[PDB]
Structure formats: C-alpha cells, structure tokens
Amino acid sequence: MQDIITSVINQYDLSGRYLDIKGINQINNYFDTGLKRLMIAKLINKEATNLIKEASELLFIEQPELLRPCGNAFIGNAYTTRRYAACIRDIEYYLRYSAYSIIAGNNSILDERVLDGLKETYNSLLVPIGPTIRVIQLLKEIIQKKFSTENIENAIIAEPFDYLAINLSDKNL
C-alpha cells in the first residue's frame, strides 16, 4: 500500500526532482484533514459492531431474496446460518479496510488487498455482486448520519465506499 504522502513522494522521485510548492500543497491538504480523519476512525471503532447490524438489516429488508433458497443454480447467498455467518464476515472486511484508507487519504490499500482478485472469488462461489455493492453503499449512508453538521467530513467518508462500488461495478455504459 501507499499513503497520500508516499504517493506524492513517489510521483516526484519518478522525475528525479525535489518537492516544490505544488507537491507541498498536496501534503498540507492531508496534514489539515489528518486530525479530522482520526475522529472518523475512532467513531467507527466505537460503533463498529452496531453499524454492521443496520447495514445487514436494511440490506435484507430490500433484498428478501438473499435469505431464501438458492435455486438450482447454486448461488451463494445468506441462505443458511453457515452462509449468513460467512456473509456477515464480509461486511466487516469492507468496514475495516475502509477505515484504514480514511486515515491513509488514498485508495491504494483498497485495491491491493480487497479488489485485486475479488470478482474472481465471488464469481467462483457465485456470490452476487449487486447486493454487495448495495451494502457497501448502505454503510456510507449510515456512517454519514453521525457527521451532518459539517460537510467536509462527508467527502472524506464517501471516498472509500465510493471506490469499492465503482471498481466492483460492471461497465454497462
């Protein structure tokens, strides 16, 4: 992975140049929101076991087909508690690895340890990608309710959960 500083420092090393004001303005934008990126991660740490329950419940209320039998095409959904237990485990991976990238200010950790090989694994177990994109976007709406006063915290929160949906999505257009 690479944090926001390492990405800016690696982009300048590729040219063999020192850091000018343009590269220092970018590092200052992270040192400004850096103290606010920790309040967001400490909130996730305290509400981590709750924010997965609402995302799971709101997902199954809209997609009741996931809690039902799989059909003769052996789709992997939350049919039984062995599948329900395994699928709630995934919802923690999206929340845990999204809290890391909020402190890194960069999505390098996301694709390197989540997206590289994900669709090959879900297409192997026949796990639906549609609902998975939904629950990832429900977590964003849930977490953003805690931060309603100031809107600069909404941009920071939407970044990790937006990247996962844009990269898991199929390009229909």
Ligand X SMILES: CCC1=C(C)/C(=C/C2=NC(=C\c3[nH]c(/C=C4\NC(=O)[C@H](C)[C@H]4CC)c(C)c3CCC(=O)O)/C(CCC(=O)O)=C2C)NC1=O
Q: Does 43 bind another protein (CB under 8 A)?
A: no
Closest CA to 22 of 6, 3, 8, 4: 8
CB-based contacts of 110, cutoff 8 Å, min separation 6:
97, 98, 101, 160, 163, 164
Q: Which amino acid is at 74?
A: F
Shortest separation between residue 84's beta carbon and ligand X, angstroms: 4
The single residue among 4, 78, 104, 133 that binds ligand X, judged by CB under 6 A, is 78
Closest CA to 39 of 86, 125, 102: 102
Shortest separation between residue 117's beta carbon and another protein, angstroms: 5
Largest CA distance in the chain: 61
Phi, psi of 150 (to 5 degrees): -100, 140
**Between 110 and 153, whose beta carbon lies closer to ligand X?**
110
Question: Residues 47-86: x/- map of binding to another protein (CB under 8 A)?
Answer: -x----------------x--xxxxxxxxxx--xxx-xxx
Residue 70 marked ligand-binding: no
Q: Footprint of ligand X on this chain (CB under 6 A)?
A: 66-67, 76-78, 80-81, 83-84, 86-87, 90-91, 93, 97, 113-114, 121, 125, 127-128, 131-132, 135
